[PDB]
Structure 1
Amino acid sequence: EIPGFYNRFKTQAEKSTNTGLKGRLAMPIRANWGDVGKVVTIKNDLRQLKNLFGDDMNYSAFKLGKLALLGNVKELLLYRLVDGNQKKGTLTLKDTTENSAKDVIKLETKYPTARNFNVTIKSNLVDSDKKDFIFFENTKQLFSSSIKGTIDEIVLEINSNLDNEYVIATKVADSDTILANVVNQALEGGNDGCTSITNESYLKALEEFERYSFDSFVLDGVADEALQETTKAWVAKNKELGKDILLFLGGKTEDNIKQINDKSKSFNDENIVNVGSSAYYENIKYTPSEVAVYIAALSVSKGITGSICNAKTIFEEVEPRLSQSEVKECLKSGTLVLDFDDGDVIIVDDVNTFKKYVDDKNEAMGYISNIMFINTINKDTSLKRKEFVGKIFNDATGQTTVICALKKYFEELMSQGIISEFNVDIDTELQATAKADEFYWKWDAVKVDVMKKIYGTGYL
């Protein structure tokens, strides 16, 4: 640059930061409003969810999004599910100067929907040629504007202000004629999003979700069986492909605790978590899958350095309600069920559906926190792939560098206290059999536990 003393001030996030959030979650959702056919990330502010997908609790989108956000996920990734017939609302405007009136402007909702987004056009009381363009939803006004009677400036203004973000205006003809007055005319022709949604839509959503990486998946708070087996196979495929995705599920409200335990027996992969209990938060019930959304969100928000075996929930009630016998039955079945151990609703344990089996996949694998730990180690290691694969020569120096980097990572874990003991070394047994263009290595560790049970004995 030219000589001088040029300041460039950077007080954007000086101390406006907090560290109370973590994790990311996947969400196929049915929605009346918002983008369609894309996987969109949502920051934890619910205002973003409300803006980008509406505020209708009749739909899985807003309700499950609110539950996930209250789960304190750092970034919530959504995908709007639709049938192919799903459509945008639309309205058309016409001129009045000519006896044979001609359509000159068309209004269409910015996102596909079927809501009653309405529009009003009336004569401007100040200027003769101006028309006052006002927009509503069921007469609840969104935005008002006034432009002279030329179509180009009218559509440009209507598309300019983001107060009119609900609707897009397009020019039908290049007229300079006075528009026709409308009063609360709905943008018709749209279709909602709950229309004929089937397993194929969920399959397409999952195929879209293959692109990204996630900490957990919950399947739209829907307990349809065939979707559950499909997602089970999909997660198994993703695991075999090096994508370590965890899955939470919730049974149907009609299922008895015996049926829920049978389903939790049917699932035995460690990445499957079955939720049995229903709950109420704002005096409104939530099916086991709807609360499975929340428990998955809370789990991913916990991340490492935590668990869920007694994490307090937002729910004001829980049902069905279990004695210690029923709780033990559910845990032995691998079911996760909420509890009312105190005046609040409390998560009973960290169990997953796998826990029915014991020894080879160890008992700690029956707990979700260990699976999150293993998936995190696999993810960081598969991040190291690109640092080390195809970039170092397999000699003693390259092996030493790889081992030193992994040792530094595990020592960082040790510094956090997550691991009580570890060692990582070359797998000389397999390294002897290794081909010259490959490397084998081994590591042992001991994750630091957490009190689930405590016992006290008193003397007087």
Structure 2
Amino acid sequence: RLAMPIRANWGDVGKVVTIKNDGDDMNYSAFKLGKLALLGNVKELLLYRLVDGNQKKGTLTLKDTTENSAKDVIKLETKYPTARNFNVTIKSNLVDSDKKDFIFFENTKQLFSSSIKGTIDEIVLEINSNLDNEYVIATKVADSDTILANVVNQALEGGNDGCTSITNESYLKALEEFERYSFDSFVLDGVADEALQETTKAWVAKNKELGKDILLFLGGKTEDNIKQINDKSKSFNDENIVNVGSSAYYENIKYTPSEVAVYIAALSVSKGITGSICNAKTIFEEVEPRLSQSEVKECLKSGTLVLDFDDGDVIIVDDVNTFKKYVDDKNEAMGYISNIMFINTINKDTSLKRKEFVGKIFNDATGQTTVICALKKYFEELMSQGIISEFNVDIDTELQATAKADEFYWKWDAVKVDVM
């Protein structure tokens, strides 16, 4: 589950929606970066739309001509709010005057074509429920059996483009809405503005205090060289935050490292705990700037997730995070994104254990032994499955010495399988 904040004219504004294995314009991220999200083969993608506040829905009004004085009986609107020229042509049917043809246009190409008799309910149900009406909603005005007027290419207007103004508050709408949802990862939509990335850093930190360690992905701007990329990576130090370094091509676009981060996040979520992308192939055809051993080492040590065309196909050199600029107490194994997601999964499972052993048990050595034994058996089960290679879960003596009656502390450490 990847949370994609699509900068698209298509998609619903201010609401979370999912799409199964099934926008279109290259300017709209529902297809430009939606393809990147889908190519990583996460089991499902969840979308959110970024739009300027000065943006509404297009509205078209139609009126009848069966009686001499025309009155509105049908009103048509774009499915999602937009100013796109979704043109509609309505003409009297060639044979029967009682049937009105409805030809819809994306811009001018024929999308849907059909005719329905004069009763308004049938017309509205057809226009709403037919398979080719994915780009329109039709609503009735009043009960009638009259016949519309003849109109050609009527453009629904009144709103504005979804890419009107990408601004900090508009971007922050996505995080505010995603607070109520949990995902495997969240990504930024290409905009390598450091203010937005720092805002998302603070947001994810707030979640980390809450525990929702949503694995974040970011990237530098097109104007960042190796030096700028490394500096920006060094600016962050969080475990769950990533800074893709190099731009990439897939079909036509010089995707920014931030735009590439969508597909990187999709791959990371798809791989899960078992899969690691430290030496995995990627869909991209090329990535720049290229990196030798020295450049690779400098970028990885600075906290950058290095992509290079080091062979006949693009290779992620290592699955590293912003905490790759580590500190002495935590080993470098902490600096791998897969390991961090693994840690988050264990944290969630041990929280399930926490809510299993609520205060019905006494805060005595017996209850602490019971909880510690449950955790030990959980890690034994994981070791039997093979993920863990060693574990030592014990009382958190440093925090437990000053623990009040109600509170208990513990801690776990475990070694994990390596992959070169």
C-alpha contact (below 8 Å) 1:244/1:378 kept by paired residues: no
Deviation at residue 44 of structure 1 after TM alignment: 4.1
- Structure 1 residue 317 and structure 2 residue 286: aligned? yes
Inter-CA distance 154–305: structure 2 relative to 1 (3 Å threshold): closer
TM-score by length of 2: 0.92
Give secondary structure in 2 for the equivalent of 1:444: strand
Q: Tell me, in whole angstroms, the C-alpha distance in 1 between the residues paired with 2:21 and 2:118.
A: 43
Matches within 5 A, 1:165-314: 165-314=134-283
Comparing 360-369 with 244-253, which one deviates more in the overlay?
360-369
Secondary structure in 1 matching 2:218: strand
Alpha-carbon distance in 1 for matches of 2:217, 2:126: 47
Q: CA deviation at 1:327?
A: 1.4
Question: 1:278-309 deviations in whole A, cap 9, x for unaligned?
Answer: 11111432111111121122122222123211
Q: Which moved more, 1:140-149 or 1:301-310?
A: 140-149
- Relative to structure 1, is the Cα distance of residues 429 and 287 closer, same or farther in structure 2, using a 3 angstrom cutoff? closer
CA deviation after TM superposition for structure 1 residue 198, in Å = 0.7
Q: SS of 2:110's equivalent? A: strand
Q: Matched residues in 2 for 1:160 and 1:307: separation?
A: 44
Shift of residue 392 of structure 1?
Answer: 4.0
Instruction: Tell me the SS of whatever aligns to 2:132.
Output: helix
What SS does the aligned partner of 2:60 have? strand
> What is the CA distance between 1:431 and its match in structure 2?
4.7
* Equivalent in 23, 29, 36 of residue 13 of structure 2: 36
Q: Structure 1 residues 42 and 168 mapped into 2: Cα distance closer, same or farther (>3 Å)?
A: closer
- Report if the CA contact (8 A) 1:41-1:75 is conserved: yes
Identity in percent: 100
Does structure 1 conserve the Cα–Cα contact (< 8 Å) formed by 2:18 and 2:47?
yes
Alignment correspondent of 2:312 = 343
| Distance across 1 between alignment mates of 2:326 and 2:412 | 24
**Cα-to-partner distance string for 1:145-202 (whole Å, 9 max, x where unaligned):** 3222233443344334354342222223444322101222222223221112210011
- Relative to structure 1, is the Cα distance of residues 262 and 394 closer, same or farther in structure 2, using a 3 angstrom cutoff? same
| Cα distance between partner residues in 1 of 2:411 and 2:300 | 33
- Structure 2 distance, partners of 1:437, 1:392, is 11
Report the Cα distance in structure 1 between the residues aligned to 2:299 and 2:38, rounded to whole angstroms: 28
Shift, 1:69, TM fit:
1.4
Shift in Å, 1:429: 6.5
Contact 1:44 1:73 in 2 (8 A): no
TM-score, normalised to structure 1's length?
0.85
3-state DSSP of counterpart to 1:290:
helix
CA distance in 2, matches of 1:375, 1:139: 50
Q: Give the 3 Å change call, closer, same or farther, for CA 270–160 of structure 1 in structure 2.
A: closer
Name the SS of the counterpart of 1:285 in structure 2. Answer: coil
Give the count of matched residue pairs.
420
Kindly indicate whether the alpha-carbon contact (under 8 Å) linking 2:281 and 2:315 is maintained by their aligned counterparts in 1. Answer: yes
- Structure 1, unaligned runs of 5 or more: 1-23, 46-53, 452-460
**1:62–1:151: structure 2 CA closer, same or farther, 3 Å change rule?**
same
Instruction: Report the CA distance between 1:400 and its aligned residue.
Output: 4.8
Q: Is the 8 A contact 2:10 2:28 kept in 1?
A: no
Q: 1:378 aligned to 347, 361, 366, which one? A: 347
Query: Aligned equivalents of 1:197 and 1:184: distance in 2?
Result: 31
Contact 1:244 1:379 (8 Å CA) reproduced: no
Deviation of the 1:424 alpha carbon: 2.6
- 2:305 aligned counterpart, secondary structure: coil
Tell me how far apart the structure 2 counterparts of residues 413 and 398 of structure 1 sit (CA, whole Å). Answer: 23
Query: Does the C-alpha gap of structure 1 residues 160 and 60 become closer, same or farther in structure 2, counting only changes over 3 Å?
Result: closer
Alignment of 1:136 onto 2:113: no
Contiguous gaps of at least 5 residues in structure 2: none
